[PDB]
Amino acid sequence: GTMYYGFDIGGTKIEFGAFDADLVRVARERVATPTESYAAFLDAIVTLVNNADAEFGVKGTVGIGIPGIADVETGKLLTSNIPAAMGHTLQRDLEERLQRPVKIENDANCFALSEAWDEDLRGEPSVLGLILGTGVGGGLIFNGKVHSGRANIAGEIGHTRLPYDALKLLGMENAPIFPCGCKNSGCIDNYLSGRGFEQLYDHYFSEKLSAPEIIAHYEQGERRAVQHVERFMELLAICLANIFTCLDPHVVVLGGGLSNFELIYQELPKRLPAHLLHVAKLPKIIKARHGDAGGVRGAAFLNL
Amino acid sequence: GTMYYGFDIGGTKIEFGAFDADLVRVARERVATPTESYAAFLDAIVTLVNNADAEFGVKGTVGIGIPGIADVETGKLLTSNIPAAMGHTLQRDLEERLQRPVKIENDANCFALSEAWDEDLRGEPSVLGLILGTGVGGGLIFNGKVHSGRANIAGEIGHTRLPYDALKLLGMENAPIFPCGCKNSGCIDNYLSGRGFEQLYDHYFSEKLSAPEIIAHYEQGERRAVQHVERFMELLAICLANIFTCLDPHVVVLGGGLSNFELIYQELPKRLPAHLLHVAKLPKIIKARHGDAGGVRGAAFLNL
Ligand SMILES: Nc1ncnc2c1ncn2[C@@H]1O[C@H](COP(=O)(O)OP(=O)(O)NP(=O)(O)O)[C@@H](O)[C@H]1O
Numbered sequence: 001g002t003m004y005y006g007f008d009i010g011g012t013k014i015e016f017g018a019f020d021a022d023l024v025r026v027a028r029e030r031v032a033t034p035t036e037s038y039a040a041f042l043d044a045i046v047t048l049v050n051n052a053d054a055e056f057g058v059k060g061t062v063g064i065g066i067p068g069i070a071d072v073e074t075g076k077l078l079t080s081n082i083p084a085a086m087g088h089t090l091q092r093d094l095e096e097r098l099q100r101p102v103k104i105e106n107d108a109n110c111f112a113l114s115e116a117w118d119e120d121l122r123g124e125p126s127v128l129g130l131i132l133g134t135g136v137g138g139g140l141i142f143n144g145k146v147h148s149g150r151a152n153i154a155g156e157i158g159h160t161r162l163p164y165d166a167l168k169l170l171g172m173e174n175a176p177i178f179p180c181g182c183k184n185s186g187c188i189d190n191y192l193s194g195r196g197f198e199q200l201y202d203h204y205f206s207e208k209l210s211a212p213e214i215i216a217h218y219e220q221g222e223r224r225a226v227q228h229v230e231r232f233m234e235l236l237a238i239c240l241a242n243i244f245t246c247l248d249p250h251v252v253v254l255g256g257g258l259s260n261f262e263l264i265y266q267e268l269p270k271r272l273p274a275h276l277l278h279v280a281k282l283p284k285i286i287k288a289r290h291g292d293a294g295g296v297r298g299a300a301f302l303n304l
Numbered sequence: 305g306t307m308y309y310g311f312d313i314g315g316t317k318i319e320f321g322a323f324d325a326d327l328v329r330v331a332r333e334r335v336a337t338p339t340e341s342y343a344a345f346l347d348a349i350v351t352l353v354n355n356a357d358a359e360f361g362v363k364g365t366v367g368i369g370i371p372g373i374a375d376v377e378t379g380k381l382l383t384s385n386i387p388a389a390m391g392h393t394l395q396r397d398l399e400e401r402l403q404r405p406v407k408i409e410n411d412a413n414c415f416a417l418s419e420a421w422d423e424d425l426r427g428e429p430s431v432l433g434l435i436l437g438t439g440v441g442g443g444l445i446f447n448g449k450v451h452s453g454r455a456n457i458a459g460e461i462g463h464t465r466l467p468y469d470a471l472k473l474l475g476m477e478n479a480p481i482f483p484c485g486c487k488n489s490g491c492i493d494n495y496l497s498g499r500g501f502e503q504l505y506d507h508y509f510s511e512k513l514s515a516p517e518i519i520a521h522y523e524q525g526e527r528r529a530v531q532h533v534e535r536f537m538e539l540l541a542i543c544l545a546n547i548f549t550c551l552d553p554h555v556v557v558l559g560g561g562l563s564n565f566e567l568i569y570q571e572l573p574k575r576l577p578a579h580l581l582h583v584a585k586l587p588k589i590i591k592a593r594h595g596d597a598g599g600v601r602g603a604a605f606l607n608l
């Protein structure tokens with residue numbers, strides 16, 4: 001047998017999955033993420049692998065999804081959310097202990113790869129995963145394989161600046177220029193995310209509603225929320241059309257909180273054509289199938 | 305033997321190249337591009353293949369580079385530059401006549417694939433080819449393979465709008481907003497290309513010098529040309545840093561006229577870090593190693 005193991009590392013939990021040669025899930029496990037020592041963090045992962053190995057009588061492949069990246073030169077984890085593993089050579093430590101290769105990828109990449117491997121999307125020459133939550137996260141898939149990038153930065157679409165046409169819609173010099181955690185300004189991370197949705201409402205209407213609350217007022221017909229959504233759908237169209245002119249994805253999968261706003265799936269095909277090239281055609285744009293359980297699938301599939 | 309044939313279709317000439325299994329170039333030929341009939345155009349290509357087949361005693365693969373695209377649904381060529389072939393199903397017509405598959409790609413993709421297949425760059429997980437000439441052309445390579453995109457639009461980086469930070473450098477509301485052949489405005493096609501270099505000089509200094517002429521005055525120390533280059537290098541840095549945040553290429557290859565301006569290769573490493581993510585690392589940035597054989601090499605390599 002071939003066996004693919006996947007780990008999704010969260011601040012609170014570690015999710016584990018084993019997948020057979022047909023990508024059928026044959027093991028499922030959730031343990032607390034050790035916040036204490038690094039040795040305990042290692043122990044959690046290593047014990048899960050060795051048990052699965054015994055149970056299935058194989059040496060499964062090992063893929064890991066992390067909220068952050070491994071420094072492409074040192075191997076050191078850059079993950080503010082996992083205190084125990086922050087600054088450790090996780091790949092090297094596990095490869096020594098597990099006597100086999102280990103792949104570690106950002107969760108945005110794992111999300112994308114999970115979606116891209118649905119029976120529906122296999123064969124697609126390219127898939128772009130977008131996560132619209134606290135920030136804008138991206139994962140670029142080409143022929144079923146994660147493009148990680150030179151420094152494991154590929155898909156950081158969130159830290160691209162508002163294009164000219166988006167600035168024009170927001171009023172050029174009068175357009176709000178939001179600060180970014182990357183210390184840059186005008187990043188689309190603070191416009192097209194759930195947080196961005198909120199921030200833009202607050203700027204123009206001087207009130208702090210959460211995204212679900214703005215959406216609720218939209219549904220009731222409130223002038224302000226209707227005006228916001230109209231602005232936002234257009235801004236989303238403009239920004240994505242820019243990214244699509246560069247990337248031309250076959251399929252675009254949306255995840256994270258704001259991906260729940262069903263209006264996006266009807267309004268994007270209507271507003272995109274005006275901003276794409278005349279000869280350009282619309283990608284298939286769907287909501288993510290796997291919600292939160294994608295991380296393990298994606299992690300496992302790093303080794304297909 | 306395997307043989308790969310490549311064709312680069314120009315308005316005036318059709319170039320042809322044959323490559324052996326080790327990618328050694330074993331034939332080169334050039335015929336006039338028929339401007340008259342489509343049948344004559346077909347004849348030019350078909351005759352070149354049949355002669356090569358006789359000479360090498362094989363049925364070579366056939367890849368073709370075009371200044372434009374084939375409509376991904378109809379197969380019809382969209383190439384204003386080749387009147388005889390404009391609007392014809394070139395792929396299907398040649399497959400019928402040559403009794404084998406035929407691949408047609410934009411020349412910007414062929415350039416990139418030609419560069420990516422250099423001995424140096426084999427094994428590179430990703431390569432971005434950029435052509436800074438009359439316009440900005442891009443070609444996205446992942447593990448030695450062209451990413452064409454959903455409608456063959458992938459890599460049209462030229463028709464992405466100036467990012468916010470580029471607009472800031474050019475003076476926001478006072479920043480010149482150049483029209484674009486795509487009927488959109490603010491496209492970087494009219495800023496970062498050779499033509500763009502000229503257009504930006506002309507805007508700020510009210511004089512029509514060609515790029516080599518501006519470069520010459522830079523070399524002599526002329527106030528105006530020094531001011532232009534400073535602006536341009538920063539604008540180039542800003543724009544590319546945006547694209548790199550999204551794509552994170554391992555290697556970036558520059559082609560086209562402005563790629564001859566050697567100052568680019570020293571000034572880009574110096575100005576990029578300020579505009580990339582703090583954790584981001586610089587791609588290898590080199591001048592094209594295969595000038596004008598790129599169309600034929602890349603065309604042929606579509607079939608590797
Ligand atoms: N059903 C929903 N509809 C609309 N917005 C939502 C919904 N659920 C959450 N959000 C918004 O999404 C944002 C947070 O997104 P969420 O994806 O839940 O973030 P997270 O838990 O930090 N994970 P991540 O996706 O990595 O950012 C907030 O701005 C919420 O208001």
Ligand SMILES: Nc1ncnc2c1ncn2[C@@H]1O[C@H](COP(=O)(O)OP(=O)(O)NP(=O)(O)O)[C@@H](O)[C@H]1O
Pocket residue numbers: 435436437438439441497498499502514515516519560561562563564565
């Ligand atoms: N050696 C050079 N140094 C600087 N600029 C140059 C040089 N050669 C050409 N250019 C400029 O590049 C532009 C034309 O680029 P060039 O690559 O020659 O165009 P093309 O062959 O007509 N089209 P393309 O190959 O698609 O870029 C003009 O602005 C020229 O001034």
Ligand SMILES: [Zn+2]
Pocket residue numbers: 158159160180181182183184185187189
């Ligand atoms: Zn940012």
Ligand SMILES: [Zn+2]
Pocket residue numbers: 462463464484485486487488489491493
């Ligand atoms: Zn354009």
